[PDB]
């Protein structure tokens, strides 16, 4: 799983 | 921005 927030 | 992959 992969999650990114900016 | 938000991105999620599973
Ligand atoms: Cl992934
Ligand atoms: Cl953040």
Curated annotation (Swiss-Prot), chains A, B:
Amyloid fibrils are degraded by insulin-degrading enzyme IDE. It is found in: Secreted. It comes from the Eukaryota. Belongs to the calcitonin family. IAPP is the peptide subunit of amyloid found in pancreatic islets of type 2 diabetic patients and in insulinomas. Can form homodimers. Interacts with IDE and INS. Interaction with INS inhibits homodimerization and fibril formation. The mature protein is largely unstructured in the absence of a cognate ligand, and has a strong tendency to form fibrillar aggregates. Homodimerization may be the first step of amyloid formation. Amylin/IAPP is a glucoregulatory peptide hormone that plays an important role in the regulation of energy homeostasis. Selectively inhibits insulin-stimulated glucose utilization and glycogen deposition in muscle, while not affecting adipocyte glucose metabolism. IAPP function is mediated by the CALCR-RAMPs (AMYRs) receptor complexes. Amylin can also bind CALCR receptor in the absence of RAMPs, although it is more selective for AMYRs. This is Islet amyloid polypeptide. It comes from Homo sapiens. The chain holds residues 47 to 52 of 89 of the full protein.
């Amino acid at each position: 799983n992969f999650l990114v927030h900016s």
